[PDB]
Design a protein around this ligand. Structure first.
Ligand SMILES: C#CCO[C@@H]1[C@@H](OCc2nc3ccc(C(=O)O)cc3n2C)[C@@H](O)[C@@H](CO)O[C@@H]1Sc1ccc(Cl)c(Cl)c1
Ligand SMILES: C#CCO[C@@H]1[C@@H](OCc2nc3ccc(C(=O)O)cc3n2C)[C@@H](O)[C@@H](CO)O[C@@H]1Sc1ccc(Cl)c(Cl)c1
Ligand SMILES: [Cl-]
Lengths: 149, 149
């Protein structure tokens, strides 16, 4: 029942999100981490411009060096805010994943492979998000949505 | 614990010890007395009484008739356009939890876990340094979760 399901997008991927990220909306991203990956990111953006760079309401950034981590942040007017670093990370080079981002009224709730991973409080209203960016060293098998509208 | 106060005498005026950066939460728990006419939560630029400090965000439940919430901004001792919410969760002799979420372009307010209203910034939130609570209300606690922490 997912909506706007696409497969194997070319990376970097920048796509217009097909409906509003109302509370209850899911973004479902399946993929895998390449063996030489250093990092990738999933960015929920207000616009697609590269100059001035579009605000990033939610930057979800797995990093694989050393024991690995996930960094989350927001870009406002081309400046990053406070990093929220999650050291309990489910991602691994060579492991496939399913990311589910649930939009709540006050935060995002992210699960990976059916298990809760992290929360991230809103800094930009989620109604301003209209673009999904996926960048870095990653293969994305599929993207789909479950809209709450 | 430096960012919470319990059972403040009303009127309460306190300096906010960090910036209301996007992502910051203000959580106010309390109870409305049986004879209340109104109370207000004011996010202020300073604490001056003469001349009266600007109020970036005046959040003002009123109990007469069917009740409402009035929101407004005071700049140089002049009130702007009132934003009136008729769907109000406040009642005499009822408890509440207010959550004010500071976003890039607005405040988002939820009471008792239910969305209540939005209020677009009219004064930059970086100018807010003081919280006031006035009127007929009992406050159990005020807490801040700063997005810089
Ligand atoms: C690496 C690096 C440097 O920059 C990253 C940010 O990444 C920017 C970014 N956007 C991209 C889009 C596409 C691609 C691509 O490969 O196509 C690569 C991209 N990179 C690296 C971000 O992760 C950001 C998250 O906080 O962290 C740093 S900046 C930074 C540093 C310290 C602090 Cl304390 C704070 Cl707050 C912030
Ligand atoms: C009642 C009353 C009159 O004034 C309020 C404002 O409240 C001022 C105020 N500040 C206080 C601080 C402390 C205490 C206390 O009891 O300790 C009481 C306070 N009061 C009443 C405001 O609610 C303001 C919000 O718009 O509305 C009115 S003015 C007004 C009238 C019409 C229009 Cl159309 C427009 Cl735009 C504006
Ligand atoms: Cl916003």
């Amino acid at each position: 029942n997912l909506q706007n399901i696409i497969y194997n997008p070319v990376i970097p991927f920048v796509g217009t999100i097909p409906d509003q990220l109302d509370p209850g909306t899911l973004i479902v991203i399946r993929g895998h981490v390449p063996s030489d990956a250093d990092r990738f990111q999933v960015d929920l953006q207000n616009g697609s411009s590269m100059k001035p760079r579009a605000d990033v309401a939610f930057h979800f950034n797995p990093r694989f060096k050393r024991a690995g981590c996930i960094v989350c942040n927001t870009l406002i007017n081309e400046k990053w805010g406070r990093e929220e670093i999650t050291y309990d990370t489910p991602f691994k080079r060579e492991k496939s994943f399913e990311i589910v981002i649930m939009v709540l009224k006050d935060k995002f709730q992210v699960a990976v492979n059916g298990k809760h991973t992290l929360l991230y409080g809103h800094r930009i209203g989620p109604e301003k998000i209209d673009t999904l960016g996926i960048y870095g060293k990653v293969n994305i098998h599929s993207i789909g949505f479950s809209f709450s509208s």
